[PDB]
Amino acid sequence: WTARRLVWVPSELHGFEAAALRDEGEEEAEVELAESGRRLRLPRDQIQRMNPPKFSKAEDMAELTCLNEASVLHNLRERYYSGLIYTYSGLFCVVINPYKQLPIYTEAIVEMYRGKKRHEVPPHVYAVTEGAYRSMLQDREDQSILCTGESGAGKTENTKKVIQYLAHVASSGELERQLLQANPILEAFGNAKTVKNDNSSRFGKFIRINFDVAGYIVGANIETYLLEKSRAIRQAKDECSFHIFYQLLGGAGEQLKADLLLEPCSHYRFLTNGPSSSPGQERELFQETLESLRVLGFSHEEIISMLRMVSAVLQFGNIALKRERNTDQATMPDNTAAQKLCRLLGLGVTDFSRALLTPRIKVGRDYVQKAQTKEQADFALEALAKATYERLFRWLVLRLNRALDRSPRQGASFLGILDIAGFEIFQLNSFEQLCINYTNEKLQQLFNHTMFVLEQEEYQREGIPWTFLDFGLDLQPCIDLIERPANPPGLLALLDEECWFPKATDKSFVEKVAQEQGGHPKFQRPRHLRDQADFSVLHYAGKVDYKANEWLMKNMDPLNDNVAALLHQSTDRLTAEIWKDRPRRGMFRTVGQLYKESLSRLMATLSNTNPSFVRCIVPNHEKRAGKLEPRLVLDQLRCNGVLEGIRICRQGFPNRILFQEFRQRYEILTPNAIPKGFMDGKQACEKMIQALELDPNLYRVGQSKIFFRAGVLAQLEEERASEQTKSDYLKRANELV
Amino acid sequence: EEEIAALVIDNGSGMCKAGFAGDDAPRAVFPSIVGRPRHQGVMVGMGQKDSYVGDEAQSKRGILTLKYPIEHGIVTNWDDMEKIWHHTFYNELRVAPEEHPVLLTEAPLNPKANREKMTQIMFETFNTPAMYVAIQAVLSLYASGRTTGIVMDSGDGVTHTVPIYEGYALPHAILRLDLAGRDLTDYLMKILTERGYSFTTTAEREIVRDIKEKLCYVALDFEQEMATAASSSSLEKSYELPDGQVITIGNERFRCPEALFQPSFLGMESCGIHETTFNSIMKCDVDIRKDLYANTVLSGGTTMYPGIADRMQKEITALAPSTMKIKIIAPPERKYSVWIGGSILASLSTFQQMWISKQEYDESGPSIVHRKCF
């Protein structure tokens, strides 16, 4: 390569394409594009350095001397066209789904992986999960695998492959094949058709594989932390609610519909945006799902019961509360709907009617009624809907784990696998979007911390003492912005305060948060012209805009203890068993609060263990290989935090080379510095670094290695290609003359 | 876009009338009031909102003390004015003033400081490419679509009088009389008190403003109507307060506007409006008077009262030579005449070169207002 300075350029067919700097001045550099060969001007900050071919198709992206999104994107692209799906970026393990079925995942490969370090072999899942398994037998401490939300990617499918590895390693009746069967169940209940994807997991899935001290499978269970239950009640403009609702509607025949008394989509208030077809023909899917349940060993009776309550949640919509002239309390003049509800549950209509409309509350020790507005009672209806759904989901998970069988229990330790939807961005970005972002924030923070401890311990292993700030702290102010209840209060807290205070509007909310918390650097009010979204924050991924409309309504989840009690008394086994219930429970209780709590549980669980990280990307909408859409990959790199990971490691000394490698490889650089061969290989590096004139800030001396900054090896490599040019010239001239 | 549109704002005291140049009516018209919470609030999760501006203030009147930032065409308090403009652009129009040239109205004979300081704000508060500050009366004359006339301009701020002939304009002849809607209001609340009704506070001062805006009318002969007040039948009208109280106002009704014609009621020597019109016309050249007598245009909010035109006609005709006929042209929609005039002026192509440019201001300073424009 010539010293034209091939430097990656922004462009809007390829996200980053190679181009020769040559002419420069100020921000504007006139640059020769490798492909077209046309010269155009752009600001120079925009344009990111390229790594030499020696780095091309690197196993580990941390190894690149130039760390930027452009270099990342090139490396990944290169790998992918080459047919290589797996790459390691820093701590991350990056996979890009080819959508083809690849010959991979044989027995030879897995055996081949065993007992080796990640660098020792090519990138693969089997490697990182090997890291987890080995760290468990070795460290005797539990491990966790984080997969970040990507479609539809077959993240689960990949995870089946992880389990396949796990089985082959741990020995000594096939694997839990019903794990495959579980997908449609949880998929049906848990997932919905959205703008980003037709199938996307709202709920987080935590899959625990339990291992004895011997290292064998005692069994497994599933845990489901976060759910968006607000999705059932409320939805985006052009999206669908959970699959089960629709597949229930079209799928159930008169045989089942007549029992459940299901109606078409137009009949239900709780179903937004109409039927929203969607089919897909449906109905067939529902049919598949029933068998999927059945093999798992749930009785037809149980299925019918389940589907009945799934109707019940929808039925909560048909109830209409009518505001009464003059009085506050409102009421329900039409018994038909709630009569239907009462058939669908154990409730007496009258009991329920009094309870809902005018509930009784324990003002110790003697009960007293309450007056409830129309709005308040509506929220209660929506609450019981949402809480009902959540309870149902929980029971499914527990009943499912019963359908999973374990050997001798309590022995000894587990490997968690977390499947959760990744950081989301839409154009509009409603409330749920914010909650998702909040969780992805904390997860990201854990990753940073993990990386931090890895690097800090790596320094000691190489004997370099260095102190540097916790990487997790970067996210912390953003997190406090959303979370922090107290001194300055957080967005969630302030939302809750808005919700309870008498005449609360969305506008009063945003104004309030501006006034309360605008001094926060990660918070930005757009102001002036639109800027359709009313306030914005600055995450790791980037700046996201939020629309505040109807946030107060989404936040409200007041729950009547009286009606809840009635459920606890239900005649039917299913629902009564479900409601087999501290906080602020009753009224108060906000979705934001519950969500926060649930996330706290999850963060504790994950925090207990040693995590490991996998990042999934889809190349294209096409569902076919050989096509990598750079823009989409950029977007994914934003929301999975990989960009953040590169901007993290840059702050430290990402490039680590051994003395021996550094000398043998680069010796050509400095014939002067390098002596006659004292050897020991330390002195070599001492000399090399010394005459090459490098700032002591830009390297450290370690036991087996030297730690380097970004771009130091870029300069040294340029001195190797310059040196090689000098030597090519001297050689060729000498041979010629 | 072509021409970029342009923005127009009429701020005589009382009302801001704003909208896009190139339209027949303004989008936003609201009272120029900055109410402040006088009473310390005790809840949590209020506001707090240090103050309220525009018809927001009207809505939440009782709590606030209201301060009109403009008095007698002079801005008393600048930050308040800035707040009002802020409200116009962001709250109603939803424009970035950087994207539009803005026209302001302003009253004649008015202190320099207001024009200069006005411009200073427009450039160094709301960054704006260009602006102009224009005399109220002329604008209304344009709106009326006549080239010649003597424009009687009385807003809530102050009353003004500018004779114009064939375009042109007569500086010596321009007259400015300190009476206004606001002074009538102050008179009116005074005159109610003899009936028992006592309105002591800014809040209810606006209630009487509202009363005047409908109930009051001008007598076609004051003494006759006052005589017929003996037998009270039609001259009394029930009015409903927001409190639910009912007010009943007889002769007190029409003597309120009478003040314009008899400022002795108010206690000022300054002649009545009709006499001021004579004062203007008489200052003008003998030749043109014929058409000024015939082309008197009324503008501004405080000419709205029913029967004013007729009274002015009777008085002017009485005073003047009956050799020439005295037509008075007072359109309905007069209230908005200034703003309409502004719309038409910014719509004019040639005008598009007369703007005070941001650039020009930056080189030459704020003082350039007088240099360039009238």
Ligand SMILES: Nc1ncnc2c1ncn2[C@@H]1O[C@H](COP(=O)(O)OP(=O)(O)O)[C@@H](O)[C@H]1O
């Ligand atoms: N319908 C009406 N009838 C009678 N008087 C009115 C009416 N509307 C407004 N006014 C009087 O005129 C004033 C409004 O004048 P306005 O046109 O806003 O002046 P400017 O254009 O200089 O601000 C009010 O304060 C009130 O006293």
Ligand SMILES: [Mg+2]
């Ligand atoms: Mg006016």
